[PDB]
């Protein structure tokens, strides 16, 4: 079972200029929460973004490219990603933007947090197809001390 997970901004913006154009630790927290202890595709993009593995769980890294870091894994094609993440019960595509797309149809539950924020973006969700999914969950939270905007965790299930 294939999942994403993604935080998006006003018009599904999700990065500028290989970063995140906010700064949530509580959609960090619900972003751990929902990845510990399962296998994590991203993009090498999204990769160099983040900087470093993601502890506790199995990173792999899609790329056209031979690898740079045997701390992660390096594959270069979505059915080499899959493969490579073995038999677990769920995987979590990380993003970004042109991996998201590719993976969308293979998917069967989204884990997206929607965030009311305006920012500037080079990078998007895919425009997916509202009618395909069934909100499972939704949990809104106001802006507080440490979280700057407003946002919403949604659960969302293929029909
Ligand atoms: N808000 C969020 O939830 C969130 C989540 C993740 C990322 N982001 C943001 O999204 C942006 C990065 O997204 P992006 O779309 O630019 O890049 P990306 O999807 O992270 O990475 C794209 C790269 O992955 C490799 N790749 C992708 N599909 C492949 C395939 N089928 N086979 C082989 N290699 C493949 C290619 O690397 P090569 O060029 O080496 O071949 C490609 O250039 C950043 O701004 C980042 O901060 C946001
Ligand atoms: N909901 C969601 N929010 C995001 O920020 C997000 N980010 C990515 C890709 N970028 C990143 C960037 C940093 C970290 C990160 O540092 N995560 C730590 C957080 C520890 C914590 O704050 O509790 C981790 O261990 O997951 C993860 C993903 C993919 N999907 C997302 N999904
Ligand atoms: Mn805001
Ligand atoms: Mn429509
Ligand atoms: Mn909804
Ligand atoms: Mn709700």
Not at 35 to 51: A, D, F, Q, Y
Not at 113 to 122: F, P
Not at 138 to 150: G, I, L, R, V, W
Request: glycine fraction near 6%; hydrophobic fraction near 40%.
């Amino acid at each position: 079972m294939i999942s994403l997970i993604a935080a998006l901004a006003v018009d599904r913006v999700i990065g500028m200029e290989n970063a995140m154009p906010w700064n949530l630790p509580a959609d960090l927290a619900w972003f751990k929460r929902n990845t510990l202890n399962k296998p994590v595709i991203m993009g090498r993009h999204t990769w160099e973004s983040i900087g470093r593995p993601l502890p506790g769980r199995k990173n792999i890294i899609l790329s056209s490219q031979p690898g740079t870091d045997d701390r992660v894994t390096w594959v270069k094609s979505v059915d080499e990603a899959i493969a490579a993440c073995g038999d677990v019960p769920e995987i979590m595509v990380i993003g970004g933007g042109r991996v998201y797309e590719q993976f969308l149809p293979k998917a069967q539950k989204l884990y997206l947090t929607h965030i009311d924020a305006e920012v500037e973006g080079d990078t998007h969700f895919p425009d997916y197809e509202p009618d395909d999914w069934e909100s499972v969950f939704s949990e809104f939270h106001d802006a507080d001390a440490q979280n700057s905007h407003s946002y919403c965790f949604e659960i969302l299930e293929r029909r």
